[PDB]
Paper text:
The membrane-anchored SNARE (soluble N-ethylmaleimide-sensitive factor acceptor protein receptor) proteins provide the energy to drive membrane fusion in various cellular contexts, such as intracellular trafficking and exocytosis. Supercomplexes of NSF, α-SNAP, and either a syntaxin tetramer or one of two binary complexes of syntaxin—SNAP-25 reveal atomic details of SNARE processing and show how sequential ATP hydrolysis drives disassembly. NSF comprises three structured domains connected by flexible linkers—the adapter N-domain followed by the D1 and D2 AAA+ domains.
The remaining 59% of particles were SNARE-substrate free and grouped into three classes with split D1 and D2 rings; presumably, this is a post-disassembly, substrate-released state, and it is not observed under non-hydrolyzing conditions. The particles show a population shift towards a flatter D1 ring that is closer to D2 relative to the non-hydrolyzing class. This is particularly clear in the case of the SNARE-substrate free classes, which also show an expanded pore. Finally, substrate-free classes are always ADP bound, even in protomer E; they are flat, have some N-domains packed between the D1 and D2 rings, and are characterized by a split in both the D1 and D2 rings between protomers A and F (right column); this is consistent with a SNARE substrate side-loading mechanism proposed for the NSF ortholog in yeast, Sec1845. In the absence of a completely protomer F-rebound state in the hydrolyzing condition, however, we cannot distinguish between SNARE substrate rebinding before or after protomer E hydrolysis; the former case (ATP in fully rebound F and E) represents a classical “hand-over-hand” mechanism, while the latter case (ATP in fully rebound F, ATP ADP•Pi in E), a ratchet mechanism in which F re-engages substrate during or immediately following a translocation event driven by protomer E hydrolysis, locking in substrate translocation. The flattened D1 rings of the SNARE-substrate-free classes with ADP•Pi in protomers E are suggestive of the latter; flattening upon hydrolysis at protomer E could exert a pulling force on the substrate, and translocation would then take place with substrate engagement by a new protomer F and release of the old protomer A. Multiple rounds of translocation are expected to ultimately lead to melting of the engaged SNARE domain and subsequent disruption of the SNARE complex.
Author numbering:
A (entry chain B): 0 to 161, 169 to 291, 297 to 335, 347 to 424
B (entry chain C): 212 to 740
C (entry chain D): 425 to 740
Write the structure that this text describes.
């Protein structure tokens, strides 16, 4: 036992022992409560806690399906088992973090679960048992099965009479458990004994889409507003104080007829800015004088007011035809980029072919925003129908049959 | 003792000192001693490196140090204007000011820097010496005549900047012409710290940044980041922090109730690092996300053996000094599931650079464009201290169709030269390749270029099939026992990929007919070991 | 002193000397700048300005690169792990190379000499050519390799070859090296296929004599002697040499000691096993196996090595 002996992997005999997360063994070989290290190869060792059951044949260790999957064990395979002794002065677990989710997708529900009660039940069930980082197991709480994954383990503090990270530790009576739900999990966790890891999220101003006139494009609108216009609303004094700049490029590509033009015009009618000045792409293909004619108003306004003129929006149309001719591309790049450039100009480009676009035009300093506007799903169609059939709903001109 | 920390440039310490000592110390000492010693002044410099590393900043800083005229600008592919004649008139309209100032003030005028750009385009005939292309060269003659020859000047200086150093004609790298040539590379660990300090000093003086921010962590969590992308990050974080306080629902407008303690917080630096910025010379998180679709399941010994060997290979290339380049070839029967093991091995390394070169992005290319794309992908991997590259279907790049046979010899001759070339210096590269036919790659003498080889087998015993079925977990104990009876006999020859398709096809029938359908499908597939 | 600097500059064209003088003056003239505030000039040393031998030597070492001269840096990428005497063949090959070198320098009726190295793959047929050339002390030592011409066409390759051979007629002595001939002709056993133009150019060049009063030497390497014998290229090479492989227990137990990785206890068992058998392995493969096996645990580095040697090694 101490030196290690060869043993045969077997299946867990009972559901209760399967939920116990303990390796089920024969009384003739070991005693309950002992800890073992199971070797499957020179680089594969896993620490388990033992429990005895009469039905285990001597010469075989029984593992549950979660244990076999975690340790990569197969029924009937040969393993090595050696007794393992914890250094309780260093390996006792004070706090451990566990990811928890519903074990079965068929039993998912939105009911709350008290993580203090689950912590107490976990301590009651798994006290004096070994746990390793990354270990997977099944936990039964209120007659509900959950999948648990060990994320982090910290050592216990010394007793009052007298925070190291550890890969494997021993759960004791006074150990503390912090639970976090899995990514995209619908589990509702309540209580204070929660890791409560939802920090990576963005707080966004509360828009009113229905009145705004757009439906089913909330996230794209939020992201564009955060990344390309959040700086021209604060007073310029703070902008100078922090030492920031203003973005100068946005590219929106998608299938024809999805709301590209609206998603920019609507924002144009929200900053109290000047009305846009649309230009077409394929028609201009003397063109240099035409290209110079567009920004003359912006140049004059900047000259008159310096760093106080309002934003001028350009909705330059399909750009794959013009840019891939070279003279227009160079003139535009010089106008936006270079020593001589205006600080009250914002270029918005739209197109259908994303791959054909050049690469030089997409670099930090140059067009630095990209988004994709795809077809709407059921929610988008519902909202679009509601917005487009509101005028008739007010005059009392729609039947109840629809 | 030139101090470059104040100027803004950080990380580029030695290169600046070298470019100063070798070709600039003779424009500071007084004219009398310079004349006595009898020295002329250099009139050319060349800079080559990857984009976004801080070159135009160096140029402007050095130009402004000596209190000279602010620089001019030109573009390479632009000066090749509408057509000829004007191609030598645009060149002419740059140096008139220098000549006029020389004549008016004699030999006491100021330096007139000229900063070219993409110089390898306007001055290129080596490109014609590659599969296809071809173009005449005339403007280089006028530029060379202006730089040196008759009516030469003593108050000029030309600085060329390029992204590719191997397509520059030798005629411009001789003494008297562009002499000094330097390289600007990706920043190292210290460079990122210095650049972050330099780029975030304004908001740390006016008491804006928060106290829970640690620069060292942000430096160590960014790997193979270019110069400009750090600025882009530090900007996006501020953008989010400012967005949080824009309380408006109608006609925008700022809120003073919350505005007061505007403080960028570590969260706004972490949320920015996960969605906003994406490095170019770094990991690619949308390439290993659509290859390992269904994960990896241990159904026997071969999986463990292959993974162990992969780990040994990936650890040898990182802790060795006598074999900077290693390679390994994976082979097996079709539908055995080997394009997924390569991705899993590569992703477990945690190397800074991991880039796949599948044949799925080249549909319709000709034999020359393939060579060009492969050379570019491999070239990008010589710019990092660690690299891993993966090649998929090494028999659909060559186009080996049994009839004939036929194939593109050019691609083979490029590929069998790239796999035996060491990186420039002190850089470690690993190459993994996948294939299904191992009896047509031996005849081409390819196997003598790969340093080893591994074998991925099929499922070949009833026990392994039963274990795989149990681990997938679709049929229960009843059907398992039923299916565990007819299958007695060690003649199960089937690939892992085919098994998922067979299971999914079987599941569609009625509950009581599934076992018979699955057995019939397994029998009809055959064995043919 | 001008004499020493003159003698220690070989095949320097006219301009490079002016470049050297300017570089030396600049280096000596930088030690007297101590202006870190807009940089104007430094006093207290504006006098005592000199140009001492140290700056001349430094400039000659790091700042000037001749065009028709030796290129030391290149060799750092071919002779990587040095040369270790593991058997008689190394001494034999080096002695023959030295005699060939001392025939193209003290002769009047044989201005041209060409030699061919060949042997089984992974036997080190390149890091011996590089070592032989580096000990000639010849003014002009180039290396033409197929990895600097990736993706080229036929005419481009012919032009590159003709140009490299055309910069060896302009120096009083030379030593031009070509490696992996079979990868220039684009040879592939299926077919076969290759480029006739390159073959004709190579033959005609190999049988050319330089202008009067100059001498040349060509060293080539290959891995398929029979194929070349088919194309009649073997009649254009004056002499050939054979590079063998490690085939005996003792010549492996000697290399394992000279490399110096495995130790006495493990060496005893390795000898006990290998000595009673024959072996067949190139020198390059041995390093890769030895550093394949060193990554295991301390108590298993002797079994994996033998197991690997039983599949590739001892596999004629
Ligand atoms: N060793 C393995 N054990 C279990 N599942 C595996 C294993 N290897 C791969 N898989 C899974 O099975 C599939 C492997 O098939 P894969 O996509 O690699 O086909 P393929 O080998 O690329 O086909 P081909 O090489 O013929 O083009 C993937 O869904 C992958 O998740
Ligand atoms: N005495 C030696 N002879 C050969 N190689 C040696 C010797 N001592 C050390 N080496 C190392 O072994 C390597 C073997 O040569 P190299 O790596 O160039 O391959 P090769 O067999 O010559 O190449 P190829 O397959 O292209 O013909 C030498 O480069 C050098 O790194
Ligand atoms: N998500 C949406 N919500 C409301 N209306 C929409 C939406 N998408 C498109 N529309 C309507 O369809 C029309 C699309 O025209 P336009 O914006 O010019 O298309 P595109 O910009 O793609 O050429 C607009 O008049 C707009 O009112
Ligand atoms: N070492 C550096 N220190 C500070 N900023 C840098 C550095 N390198 C690049 N940058 C940033 O890059 C931008 C300029 O990029 P540039 O060097 O012109 O790119 P490229 O050389 O590819 O044209 C500047 O805004 C500058 O802040
Ligand atoms: Mg595949
Ligand atoms: Mg070779």
């Amino acid at each position: 036992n101490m030196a290690g002996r060869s043993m045969q992997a077997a299946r867990c005999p009972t559901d209760e022992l399967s939920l116990s997360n303990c390796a089920v063994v024969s009384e003739k070989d070991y005693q309950s409560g002992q800890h073992v290290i199971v070797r499957t190869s020179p680089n594969h060792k896993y620490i388990f806690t033992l429990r005895t059951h009469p039905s285990v044949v001597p010469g075989s260790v029984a593992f549950s399906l979660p244990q076999r999957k975690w340790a990569g064990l197969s029924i009937g395979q040969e393993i090595e088992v050696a007794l393992y002794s914890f250094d309780k002065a260093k390996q006792c677990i004070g706090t451990m973090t566990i990811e928890i989710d519903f074990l079965q997708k068929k039993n998912i529900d939105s009911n709350p679960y008290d993580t203090d009660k689950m912590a107490a039940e976990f301590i009651q069930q798994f006290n004096n048992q070994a746990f390793s980082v990354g270990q997977q197991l099944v936990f039964s709480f209120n007659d509900k099965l959950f999948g648990l994954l060990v994320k982090d383990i910290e050592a216990m503090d010394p007793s009052i009479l007298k925070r190291q990270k550890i890969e494997v530790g021993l759960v004791v009576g006074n150990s503390q458990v912090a639970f976090e739900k899995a990514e995209n999990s619908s589990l509702n966790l309540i209580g204070k004994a929660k890791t409560k890891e939802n920090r990576q999220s963005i707080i966004n101003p509360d828009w009113n889409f229905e009145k705004m006139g757009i439906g089913g494009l909330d996230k794209e609108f939020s992201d564009i507003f955060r990344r390309a216009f959040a700086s021209r609303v604060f007073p310029p004094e703070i902008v100078e104080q922090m030492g920031c700049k203003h973005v100068k490029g946005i590219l929106l590509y998608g299938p024809p007829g999805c709301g590209k033009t609206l998603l920019a015009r609507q924002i144009g009618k929200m900053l109290n800015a000047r009305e846009p000045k649309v230009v077409n792409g394929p028609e201009i293909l003397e063109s240099e004088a035409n290209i110079r004619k567009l920004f003359a108003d912006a140049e004059e306004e900047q000259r008159r007011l310096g760093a106080n003129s309002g934003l001028h929006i350009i909705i330059f149309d399909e750009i794959d035809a013009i840019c891939k001719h070279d003279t227009v591309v160079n003139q535009l790049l010089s106008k936006i980029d270079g020593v001589e450039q205006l600080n009250n100009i914002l270029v918005i480009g739209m197109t259908n072919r994303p791959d054909l676009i050049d690469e030089a035009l997409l670099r930090p300093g140059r067009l630095e925003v990209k988004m994709e506007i795809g077809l709407p799903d059921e929610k988008g169609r519902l909202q679009i129908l509601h917005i487009h059939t509101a005028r008739m709903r007010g005059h009392q001109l729609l039947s109840a049959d629809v | 003792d030139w101090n470059f920390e104040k100027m803004g440039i950080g990380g580029l310490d030695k290169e600046f000192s070298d470019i100063f000592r070798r070709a600039f110390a003779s424009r500071v000492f007084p004219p009398e001693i310079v004349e006595q010693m009898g020295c002329k002044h250099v009139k050319g410099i060349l800079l080559y490196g990857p984009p976004g590393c801080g070159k135009t900043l160096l140029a402007r800083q050095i130009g402004k140090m000596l209190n000279a005229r602010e620089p001019k600008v030109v573009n390479g592919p632009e000066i090749l204007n509408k057509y000829v004649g004007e191609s030598e008139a645009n060149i002419r309209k740059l140096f008139a000011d220098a000549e006029e100032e020389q004549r008016r003030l004699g030999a006491n005028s100021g330096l007139h820097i000229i900063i070219f750009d993409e110089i390898d385009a306007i001055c290129k005939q080596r490109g014609s010496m590659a599969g296809s292309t071809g173009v005449h060269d005339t403007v280089v003659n006028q530029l060379l005549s202006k730089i040196d020859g008759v009516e030469q000047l003593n108050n000029i200086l030309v600085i060329g900047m390029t992204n590719r150093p191997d397509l520059i004609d030798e005629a411009l790298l001789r003494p008297g012409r562009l002499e000094v040539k330097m390289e600007i590379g990706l920043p190292d660990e210290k460079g990122r710290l210095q650049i972050l300090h330099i780029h975030t000093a304004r908001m740390r003086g006016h008491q804006l940044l928060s106290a829970d921010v640690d620069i060292k962590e942000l430096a160590v969590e960014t790997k193979n980041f270019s110069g400009a992308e750090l600025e882009g990050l530090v900007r996006a974080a501020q953008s989010t922090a400012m967005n949080r306080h824009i309380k408006a629902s109608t006609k925008v407008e700022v809120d003073m109730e919350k505005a007061e303690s505007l403080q960028v917080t570590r969260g706004d630096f972490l949320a920015s690092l996960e969605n906003d910025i994406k490095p170019a010379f770094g990991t690619n998180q949308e390439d290993y996300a659509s290859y390992i679709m269904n994960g990896i399941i241990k159904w026997g010994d071969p999986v463990t053996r292959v993974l162990d060997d992969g780990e040994l290979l990936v650890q040898q290339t990182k802790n060795s000094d006598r074999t900077p380049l290693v390679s390994v070839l994976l082979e097996g029967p079709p539908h055995s599931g080997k394009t997924a093991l390569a991705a899993k091995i590569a992703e477990e390394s945690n190397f800074p650079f991991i880039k796949i070169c599948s044949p799925d992005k080249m549909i319709g290319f000709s034999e020359t464009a393939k060579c060009q794309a492969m050379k570019k992908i491999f070239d990008d991997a010589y710019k990092s201290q660690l690299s891993c590259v993966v090649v998929d279907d090494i028999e659909r790049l060559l186009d080996y169709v049994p009839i004939g046979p036929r194939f593109s010899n050019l691609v083979l001759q490029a590929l069998l030269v790239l796999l035996k070339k060491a990186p420039p210096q002190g850089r470690k590269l690993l190459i993994i390749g996948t294939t299904s036919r191992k009896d047509v790659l031996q005849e081409m003498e390819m196997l003598n270029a790969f340093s080893t080889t591994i074998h991925v087998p099929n499922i070949a015993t009833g026990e392994q099939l039963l274990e795989a079925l149990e681990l997938l977990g679709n049929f229960k104990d009843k059907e398992r026992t039923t299916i565990a009876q007819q299958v007695k006999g060690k003649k199960v020859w089937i690939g892992i990929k085919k098994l998922l398709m067979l299971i999914e096809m079987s599941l569609q029938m009625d509950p009581e007919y599934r076992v018979r359908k699955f057995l019939a499908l397994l029998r009809e597939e055959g064995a043919s070991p």
